[PDB]
Design a protein around this ligand. Structure first.
Ligand SMILES: CNC(=O)c1ccc(Cl)c(-c2ccc3c(c2)CCCN3C(=O)c2c(F)cccc2Cl)c1
Length: 219
């Protein structure tokens, strides 16, 4: 039950640090882009559309940093390892967090006040990647994660002791192990263990968050 106090702690850090309130996202599912707004976005140059998207992604990252800061043990890690973990994991967490912005019923995603499909992002240069991002959100949305589960899962996406560059490896390993124990305890308690087998495989998140995203300093 130190474990259950950890579960509650991680869930509160997550709830305090969302960019978007879940209930606002659900409210807005009826609010969908017209054929003309989609065309208005398809018409934008590659540059301006990346500028747009890289801005949103940088704000989304700041919310993940604030998640890390409010997370138990994280802030007692040495500064080098805080930076290593966030550099390695922050994009991944944003990707995982976007499934709450995704509506599996019509395959739309929340974007700049309204919901739209993947053809919204045509001006970007990368239909393969967009498709892959959508397919992944579609799969992650199928778990119907509780708020607890997604808080713990994203905690673990972040506190990963296999990140090249950590000095105090062991101290991150204990933090990871305690988060793992919290997660498996909570899943066992609610008979949700089965979802473990449906989580993304080792290296799936990495492969989404490398293709095309990095060196965005240019926007
Ligand atoms: C009012 N606020 C917003 O609308 C808002 C807030 C937060 C965010 Cl994160 C977004 C947003 C940002 C980027 C993207 C999407 C939504 C949906 C698809 C394109 N995309 C990506 O996921 C992105 C990625 F993660 C990997 C590779 C390529 C890309 Cl472009 C929009």
């Amino acid at each position: 039950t130190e474990i259950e106090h950890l579960v509650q702690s991680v869930c509160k850090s997550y709830r305090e640090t969302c960019q978007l309130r879940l209930e606002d996202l659900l409210r807005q599912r009826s609010n969908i882009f017209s054929r003309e707004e989609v065309t208005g976005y398809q018409r934008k140059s590659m540059w301006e559309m990346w500028e747009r998207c890289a801005h949103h992604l940088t704000e989304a990252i700041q919310y993940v940093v604030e998640f890390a800061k409010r997370l138990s043990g994280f802030m007692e890690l040495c500064q080098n390892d805080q930076i290593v973990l966030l550099k390695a994991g922050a994009m991944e967490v944003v990707l995982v967090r976007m499934c709450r912005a995704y509506n599996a019923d019509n395959r739309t995603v929340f974007f700049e006040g309204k919901y739209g499909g993947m053809e919204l992002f045509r001006a970007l240069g990368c239909s393969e990647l967009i498709s892959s991002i959508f397919d992944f959100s579609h799969s992650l949305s199928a778990l119907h994660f509780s708020e607890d589960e997604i808080a713990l899962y994203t905690a673990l996406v972040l506190i990963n002791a296999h990140r090249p560059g950590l000095q105090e490896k062991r101290k991150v390993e204990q933090l990871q192990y305690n988060l793992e124990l919290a997660f498996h305890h909570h899943l066992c308690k609610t008979h949700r263990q089965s979802i473990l087998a449906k989580l993304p495989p080792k290296g799936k998140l990495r492969s989404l968050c490398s293709q095309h995203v990095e060196r965005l300093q240019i926007f």
